[PDB]
Amino acid sequence: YYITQVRKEKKGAGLEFATPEEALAAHERGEVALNAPIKVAGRETSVGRLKYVFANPDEALLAVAHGIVDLQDVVTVRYMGKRLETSPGRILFARIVAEAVEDEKVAWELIQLDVPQEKNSLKDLVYQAFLRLGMEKTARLLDALKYYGFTFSTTSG
Amino acid sequence: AEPGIDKLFGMVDSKYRLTVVVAKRAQQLLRHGFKNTVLEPEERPKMQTLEGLFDDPNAETWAMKELLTGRLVFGENLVPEDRLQKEMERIYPGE
Amino acid sequence: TSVYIEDVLHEFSTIPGVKEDVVEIILNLKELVVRFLNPSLQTVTLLLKAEGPKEVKARDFLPVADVEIMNPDLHIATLEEGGRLNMEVRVDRGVGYVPAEKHGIKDRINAIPVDAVFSPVRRVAFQVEDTRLGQRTDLDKLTLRIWTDGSVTPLEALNQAVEILREHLTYFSNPQ
Amino acid sequence: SPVDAATQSLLSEELEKALSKLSEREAMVLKLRKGLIDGEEVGAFFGVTRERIRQIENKALRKLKYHESRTRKLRDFLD
Amino acid sequence: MEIKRFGRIREVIPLPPLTEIQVESYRRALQADVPPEKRENVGIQAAFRETFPIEEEDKGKGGLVLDFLEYRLGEPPFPQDECREKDLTYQAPLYARLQLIHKDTGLIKEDEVFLGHIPLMTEDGSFIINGADRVIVSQIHRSPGVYFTPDPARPGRYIASIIPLPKRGPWIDLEVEPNGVVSMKVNKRKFPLVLLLRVLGYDQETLARELGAYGELVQGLMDESVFAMRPEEALIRLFTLLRPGDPPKRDKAVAYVYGLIADPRRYDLGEAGRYKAEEKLGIRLSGRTLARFEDGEFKDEVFLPTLRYLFALTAGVPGHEVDDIDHLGNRRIRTVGELMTDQFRVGLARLARGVRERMLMGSEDSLTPAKLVNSRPLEAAIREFFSRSQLSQFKDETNPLSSLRHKRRISALGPGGLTRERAGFDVRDVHRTHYGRICPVETPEGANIGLITSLAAYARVDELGFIRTPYRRVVGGVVTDEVVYMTATEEDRYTIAQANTPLEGNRIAAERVVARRKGEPVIVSPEEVEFMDVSPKQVFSVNTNLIPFLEHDDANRALMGSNMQTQAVPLIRAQAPVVMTGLEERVVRDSLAALYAEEDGEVAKVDGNRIVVRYEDGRLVEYPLRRFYRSNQGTALDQRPRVVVGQRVRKGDLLADGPASENGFLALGQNVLVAIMPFDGYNFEDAIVISEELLKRDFYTSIHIERYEIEARDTKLGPERITRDIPHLSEAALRDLDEEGVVRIGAEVKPGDILVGRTSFKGESEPTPEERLLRSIFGEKARDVKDTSLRVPPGEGGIVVRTVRLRRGDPGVELKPGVREVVRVYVAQKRKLQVGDKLANRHGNKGVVAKILPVEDMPHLPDGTPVDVILNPLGVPSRMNLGQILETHLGLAGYFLGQRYISPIFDGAKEPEIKELLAQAFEVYFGKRKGEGFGVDKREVEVLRRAEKLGLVTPGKTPEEQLKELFLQGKVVLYDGRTGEPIEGPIVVGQMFIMKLYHMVEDKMHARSTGPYSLITQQPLGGKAQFGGQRFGEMEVWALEAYGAAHTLQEMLTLKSDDIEGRNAAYEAIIKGEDVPEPSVPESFRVLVKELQALALDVQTLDEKDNPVDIFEGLASKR
Amino acid sequence: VVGPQLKLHQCGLPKRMALELFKPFLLKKMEEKGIAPNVKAARRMLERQRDIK
Secondary structure (H helix, E strand, C coil): CCCCCCCCCCCCCCCCCCCCCHHHHHHHHCCCCCCCCCCCCCCCCCHHHHHCEECCHHHHHHHHHCCCCCCCCCEEEEECCEEEEECHHHHHHHHHHHHHCCCCCHHHCCCCCCCCCCHHHHHHHHHHHHHHCCCHHHHHHHHHHHHHHHHHHHHCC | CCCCHHHHHCCCCCHHHHHHHHHHHHHHHHHCCCCCCCCCCCCCCCCCCCCCCCCCCCHHHHHHHHCCCCCCCCCCCCCCHHHHHHHHHHHCCCC | CEEECCCCCCCCCCCCCECCCHHHHHHHHCCCCEEECCCCCCEEEEECCEECCEEEECCCCECECCEEECCCCCEEEEECCCCEECCEEEEECCCCEECHHHHCCCCCCCCEECCEECCCEEEEECCCECCCCCCCCCCCCCCCEEEECCCCCHHHHHHHHHHHHHHHHCCCCCCC | CHHHHCHHHHHHHHHHHHHHCCCHHHHHHHHHHHCCCCCCCCCCCCCCCHHHHHHHHHHHHHHHHHHHHHCCCCCCCCC | CCEECCCCCCCCCCCCCCCCCCHHHHHHHCCCCCCCCCCCCCHHHHHHHHCCCCCECCCCCCCECEEEEEEECCCCCCCHHHHHHCCCCCCCECEEEEEECCCCCCCCEECCCCCCECCCCCCCCCEECCCCEEEECEEEEECCEEEEEECCCCCCCEEEEEECCCCCCCCEEEEEECCCEEEECCCCCCCCHHHHHCCCCCCCCCCCCCCCCCCCCCHHHHCCCCCCCCCCCHHHHHHHCCCCCCCCCCCCCCCCCCCCCCCCCCCCCCCCCHHHHHHHCCCCCCCCCCCCCCCCCCCCCCHHHHHHHHHHHCCCCCCCCCCCCCCCCCEEEECHHHHHHHHHHCHHHHHHHHHHHHCCCCCCCCCCCCCCCCCCCHHHHHHHHHHCCCCEEECCCCCHHHHHHHHCEEECCCCCCCCCCCCCHHHHCCCCCCCCCECCCCCCCCCCCCCEEEEECCCECCCCCCCEECEEEEECCEEEEEECCECCHHHHCCEEECCCCCECCCEECCCCEEEEECCCEEEECHHHCCEEECCHHHCCECCHHHCCCHHHECHHHHHHHHHHHHCECCECCCCCCCEECCCHHHHHHHCCCCEECCCCEEEEEECCCEEEEEECCCCCEEEECCCCECCCCCECECCCECCCCCCCCCCCCEEECCCCECCCCECCEEEEEECCCCCCCCCCCCEEEEECHHHHCCCCCEEEEEEEEEEEECCCCCCCECCCCCCCCCCCCCCCCCCCCCCCCCCECCCCCECCCCEECCCCCCCCHHHHHHHHHCCCCCCCCECCCCECCCCCCCEEEEEECCCCCCCCCCCCCCEEEEEEEEEEEEECCCCCCEEECCCCCEEEEEEEECHHHCCECCCCCECCEECCHHHCCCCCECHHHHHHHHHHHHHHCCCEEECCCCCCCCHHHHHHHHHHHHHHHHHHHHHHCCCCECCHHHHHHHHHHCCCCCCCCCHHHHHHHHHHHCEECCECCCCCCECCCCEECEEEEEEEECCCCCCCCCCCCCCCECCCCCCECCCCCCCCCCCCCHHHHHHHHHCCCHHHHHHHHCCCCCCHHHHHHHHHHHHHCCCCCCCCCCHHHHHHHHHHHCCCCCCCCECCCCCECCCCCCCCCCC | CCCCCCCCCCCCCCHHHHHHHCHHHHHHHHHHCCCCCCHHHHHHHCCCHHHCC
16 A cells, blocks of 8 residues: 555645646746645646656656655656556556566556555455466465565555 | 466366365375376476485375376276276386 | 583572572673684683672683783672682683573583673664765765774774675676 | 384284294294293293203294394384 | 653552452451450451350250360461472461360360361461462452342332341342232241231231331231231241241240341441441341340341331332442452351351260260360361362462462352352443442453452452442542542442542632542532542552553553563563553562561671671571572562662662562563564564564573472382383483482483483283293393383473472371372573564553564664564554553653653653653754764655655754654654665654563473373373374364365364274374375264163164164174 | 465474474384484484484
8 A cells, every 4th residue: 555655745826737838837947946746736737747757667666766756656657558647656566466477468457556555455456366367376466465565564664 | 376276176077076086196196106107207296305206205296297287087987996906006016 | 601600500599608699690791791812712711719708890800811801890799708609601702692502511510501692793873974075965975883892893893894795795706 | 002003013023024034943932932822941842852942942042133133123122 | 760750649648558458357367466355356256256155955964065265376387488398288276275064063174175277378468278379369249238129020119138148147038919918038938027027026006007107018018917916926827837847836946046146147246237237227236137035035126127118118219229239339348358267167067066966975074175076177178268169279470460469359259159150241340339449441351251350459348348449538629638448338428529630739720520429420519529539540450550551541452451461471681661650669569579678777698598687776687588489380589689788778678679570660571672663574463573682682581490290109010219220222311310310400401301210010910922022032131110200291391400309208298198209300491582472561562473583684773773672553553552652752762861750540741741851852862963973864864755745744944853853753764774775754663661471381382193092082182291182173173074174074083083993003004104094983983872872772873775884893793 | 473475375383393293204204214224213213302313
């Protein structure tokens, strides 16, 4: 849950950017100022979604690696034929499973990379791989989640 | 868990059968030394202090590594109950 | 590593003429810091023997060649009039933490092994704080600190360490 | 209890294997004696007199003792 | 260190001697230290007096008067210490000067006659029965008197009840039924209330108007006007309405019984029963119950008030007479004394019976002494009450605290004449009264709820077992300092105010103030306040009052936390909590772990063994210090001496500490650096991860002792010897068996070893043929004896620390029949802290050690210092005991600041004050750095980026500052010592007192593979070495049944247990290397057939066709 | 106790336990390896904790 989630912060000046152009440059500097965060209320987009945009899944992680964007930060990345707007963590989770189970596409046909992962959220995913895939391949799916869960957690602070 | 437990669970008409079958074959895989096996040459059973599972480790792990590969045969009533143990004690050395 | 008292049979007894419990004493030696002088001493044995009104202390350990007791004043036991205390304390050179249930040494049959730690290092701390230097300012300033019983040197240690590591990177050699 | 029921197993067969490597003319008399009925050296043997009892007895017994020292089967007392 | 306490509600008066309930009573019980001249005749003196004047007049010849003169005790057979070395009770001499009278010539006076022996109470409170410290558990019951309860099935009106004690005192009831019949069941069957009301002159003219003219029920009384016309006739008339065969002319026959002597009487004139009788109803009652005989004419100051109250109850409003059967003003507790004194009078009964026969056996004048009284009675019952009495068990003495809470526990279950085990539901609830009388938490959990309870800290039994409590007075605004321990009943009478009520010296300080009117939380006015509460401490029991922020822990958990403490195994590295409630010293001082000094003086010789005080009165005394002694539980007790040499002592100040005594305070655990966060699932559900650094410094280690024993049974096959002969394999096994027979002191005795050697004779009645031939071949002169030597039970065993033999020429022992000699090999072990162990804090975070981690990679502060334990947070949201989270915050500030804290129950520290200490802490923690010459990690700054989005810090402020805000919440920036990388997010850390838990014998990881079996049933059993089998429960059967686990279930029903042929076949089958032998049958069944067959019922199994099948395999085919 | 990095497939019990458990299955293996010549013998090996090579 910690890893796949987003944030939201202070709303000062009204920011409904989806429309204007000068509502990008001016708000990008103000972001470098003390009013428009990166997790700011930007309906169609928050300055975060503009600044960082990555080409490859990996790309996202290194950034996190370098203290650029945290896993819970609003970013834009390029997954199969689509400019997905999400967080590094959310994309990480996808991998975590995509890896656990190499059928990278299937892994997509069942995970809701849009909401935080809770108890039911997962439950669904488990009962999913069960039906869809094998059974034993689902044994490892759990263990995988066991691992990435016992680890992120300890650092979640 | 176990290598292809599904494929195994799918080559029979009941969960409880696969069990018997692997069980019965395993017993005979011992009752008659360890040469009545249906496979062996290349990549097959193995342990590690030295590669010694090749001879006598798990009875049943074998039953399941054989019955999984489409070599063995089994049925409700395939071959006459008594003459079975006969030939079997006749073709396979081990004791 | 192991102690041997005069008239004490087992670790759970009481020395007449010594407030201390025979388990409070071996618990007191676990705080003894010796500094061997050269390799030829994987082990040394220290003796003592005191009587009457006296507070047995480290200094009271009758000296030895290559051995220096950095802990001259740490208490050992309290003795009253008519109290006898003549013991034998086997010291050692080792590494890590080893339960007395693990080495169980056999000097005199009546001896009792002491659990023992070996790290001369008491605690390592480091503080990587940025450091400004013209060009850019995302400059790292590593500066590890080390405390030590004295058995060895904060510095001596720092070196063995960096070596042990250098020696370790060494296994990243022959592929297969 | 199982460990004993297993000892009569080993004891039986091993003493019975070390029963054959003998000249039945006297072995099978002490064998069944303590073995079969009950343990009296006098009215011991069928026909032959006493001095031939102890004879093959004390000798067979011993030969029986050393052919086993080699093939150590009973050594570690099954009892 | 420094100790700073918190909050303040001027605790007016100290706690009571926490053992008064026990000591003090047993005192008044048997006044042995005061001459018969003194004026006290209760319990012992009472029972006696009550059971002596035996006036057996005529049944032939005798008329022998036998009185009591002076009872007395004097010198016990052996001392205590010795009473535990051997196996005897710690009794005392008990005789009294008796003399009998002759309706002729002579009044022989044969003084001393010790008719048995009566046990004694230790200075601490317990007894000694056979080597084991025993304690008697207090008990509650229905206070004698009268009560009116709502009639069972008829929602009409209510009935009455007369309750006496002894049980011989008739338990009467009253009830009316208008259309011709009224009722009163003394013994049983009903009869006219007036039928007996006339047996006392009470006529229908004075009774009908001077009793209930204000009651329309008098018409149910006048009814039978026929019997209502003859005085001393209703004494025979009713005497007839009974049923034996008896004579209608037995004058003062059974009416005596309902008079004075034994039945209706309560202990002593004044309060043993009149309190209830009077206060509640009526006004007076001379003598005990309806007592009198000096005139022949009876007086019943009993039956008149009852009706004069029932008719007063079933009508109008005298007040609100209904009676709460569970009000503590109606339930009484019987201290050890009453429990003993009563079982002491059952003995005077069996005696008075065996003696009556002797008044009809003796020749003539040689009778007073032994020809009239024998000890066999009294000495078998009392003994029986100390040895088997359900209301008496082992002294839970894992630790001082325990042996104290036990001593003062109360149980409903007991005599049987008092609350059994069917009932409960309403009697288990905590009552509006337990406030300050019994804890509302302490009680057990499970089938035994509310029946067993422990009382409050200030509570105490006044005069007649009506648990009272310290309540102080308040005149108008003025608040007294004087206290009046009040009974339940006489409490409801006032408007009591709580203890945490703002004060101005002696003046409440607020128009509104919370008080409690008979269990009714009310916000009242000052001038109304009549009484106030002494302090919170009084509301709760003892154990509970040792918890830190109680007030923040869901009472549901307060219990765990309160019982955990009891399981506190006495660590060698004892240590008092960084935060203390207050009772720290009181517990130790009042239990008896540490050794204090009587009066001023100096110090002579402090020996790990002895302390000799130098009192300034010229004298000097040695004080023995039980070194490494064995406790019932096994947790050692060693009084380490604290006072140095020739030190000028201060009266009352401890000399040496006890098991849990650290400096003099209660040390049940070890203050330790905790950092509550999650780990790699190592602390998953309730698990705990530890810092191996705790082991390096002998911290959570404890000294435990075990006592193995063996006898030289005197079989008829040859005496059993205890020689150094192990007839078969090695000397390597004899080694430590140095001494001939027993084992040498201080020898490591790993399991399987020979603690003692012994030898009995192999076969029942015969050698062995098969084995005959085998032994002869290698040396027939093979010692035909068996090695039945006592060995170290699988599991573990430390090193021999002391042994005890008892061969021939027995000193004073009591070797049982067949016991030639017993041997004992006490062993001791320094159990270190290892996985699988359990720890817990006083709040209830009970958890089990699951991972020991190397200092090198667990959570470390910024400055090298690495935590000790890692608690999972997920354990605190649900268990609503945030209390423990305050203990850590306050705790951290206790670290860096180098000082302790006391945080009283309710009036303790508050978030703010703590928030202040944390700040003054942040310096010692951070101020240093600023001076040691270092800035802030390139990590700390990074965590601060996250620490704001979290919203734990004011954006913009300086990094330096930001940490203060953070640290003050209790959180710091920890580094993952496995990587150097920071746990992304501040984490709370700090000092938390954590105790180790005592391992039950269940802990002994058991394990069986093959073992004995019952003679009868043939299912498995353990013993000395082999482990006992596991019971395959029905539910366990279903689980398997539910599973396709067909065979697996039959396995358990035969092989692994009930198949003799099976296991047998089975064992071997394995060894050789085959699939087990298909199960025979279970004996359990075979036993059923023959069992069933014992009953003319034939049970024969069948086949395909209805043709026989033989279970008992052929063994049942006759001859 | 929790077995974190463990795998569903497995579980972890103490040897000291396992030892008793399949004891006889061990005796036999004991005789197969050279750590004991015969059963009854091997039995002795596993009777005292100190003599367990």
